[model samples]
Target: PRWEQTHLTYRIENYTPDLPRADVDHAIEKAFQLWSNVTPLTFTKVSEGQADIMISFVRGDHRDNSPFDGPGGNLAHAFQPGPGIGGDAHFDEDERWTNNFREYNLHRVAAHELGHSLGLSHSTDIGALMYPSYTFSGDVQLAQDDIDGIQAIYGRS
Candidate 1:
């Protein structure tokens, strides 16, 4: 059987002008690479509506049952797998997004969303990206258990 792909390929849709597009793309690319190093999955950038997965940045209820509630609520949300919008992922646009070392830490939150997009649920492990609660207040590092979980699902390279 074909092993499941990790990232599922995605591109930002209806991007906001406030944040630099390059930074957003870079953050997501880094997120995929981070998981790629741990598992056999791969990701790619593609045109809109053409990817196995699609990413969009929206603030407060962007056509889903779950609304982001602006900020300080749900930072982002993604679907496991199914039909349309099922494998797609969404990030809260209201959050401070940055790529610098001590910046808004977009990669950190993006990584967590990636886990959800890839069929992984919130990890009970406190150190895990799948951990139910997280804050953008500080820097984040992917834990060993988090790597192990991704590898467990996609297998090692």
Candidate 2:
């Protein structure tokens, strides 16, 4: 059967003092909006236990096998939907996550991580959000394949 990938629901938890809670929420909401604006996947904010997805902020060795490196290596991770802990997003609190007008865009990175969380694999497309490496360019944007992939799972609605 074709996978009926549904629009996910999520909640934010364990915020860091690096940025204000509202900024973090806005940054994440922007990420979700990025996808929603282009695809059928709708991300809704809900209370804990009422959400299908969970955005979590964590430091090194936070329950999962993947631990955040001190500096810039592997800053975040997310799981595919399923049982316990599935569709959970863990961002490295060690990261300088800011909502500033800088090269490193937090909202973009969150959108990429959401791809993994929603079972979207990495794309070979260099400029794609699914790219393994984060590239900051003047025209940094999602590619056609990236759009099609996300739309393949959930179309533009």
Candidate 3:
């Protein structure tokens, strides 16, 4: 189900030491904005307590049915909007998370996962941000398919 509210909250349950703390925060903020820029959705970061979405970086078998593949198979995943574990996103701690293109770009990957967290599914378009694969870094633009899908659920901003 899609989130009923236009404004949502998210909490960074933990951080990865792979990148500078500010860089990680920057990436996460920008990733969320990618969706907000297209829809009526607005996201605010919460420092403590429960939030609509919980973002975390975890290693293998961190209490989910899916375990991290230890690099390059599945970079991350997010639950669809709902209660409990819904709207949460998990990144594979095995991968070298970076702000640049050298390794997986947290901005792009997080943006893609956030799409799932907001109820958008993988797209058939390879150029789409929610296409089930992270093929680029540094720069990311939500393809029209992505914009359409998200807007269809949340409407234009």
Candidate 4:
């Protein structure tokens, strides 16, 4: 149902062609720390071997039940915490993923996917970061509901 330990690990299987390698790294790290900023869970990157969350960028039929639909629709997705494929995150390689507001911001989308990996589901609240869909906000900080939901799963930092 949930990850047994507080200290979790993740790995970037590959990078998207849209942005620089370091930008992806920063975005993914920031996305995880967004939760760690308020919750007890911690995230680390593993260069080799399996990790709690295996993140990647793929396109078309990438061998999952859910496949990327090219440059539009469904920017990314992640699984709930568990073993095997659980906690893995995938992004659409076709989308113009960006570090800033020019396109689907990696930090924004990754943070949302990170929410799923950490036991949070979509929030219907329009302003909530966990909403099924979202817009660009300079502040990607978790909403009160987000903090509440994560704290329910892992308590405070």
Q: Rate the local accuracy (lDDT) of all candidates.
A: 0.70, 0.74, 0.79, 0.78
Q: Candidate 4 — which residues are off by over 4 angstroms?
A: none
Write down the lDDT that model 2 would get.
0.74
Model 4 clashing residue pairs (backbone):
none
Ranking by TM-score: 4, 3, 2, 1
Candidate 4 residue-wise lDDT, 60-124, digit = tens: 88888887766666777777777878787778787777777785677887787777776678878
Q: State the number of backbone clashes in model 3.
A: 0
Instruction: Point out the worst 10-residue segment of candidate 3 by lDDT.
Output: 130-139
List TM-scores for all candidates, in order.
0.80, 0.85, 0.91, 0.92
- lDDT digits (tens) for residues 15-88 of candidate 1: 66656877767767777887777777778787755777777778766667887665667677777666676777
Q: Looking at candidate 4, what is the lDDT of residue 46?
A: 86
Q: List the residue pairs that clash in candidate 3.
A: none
Which regions in candidate 3 have their CA more than 4 angstroms from the true location? none
Q: Which portions of model 1 miss their true places by more than 4 Å?
A: 1-7, 100-104, 135-140
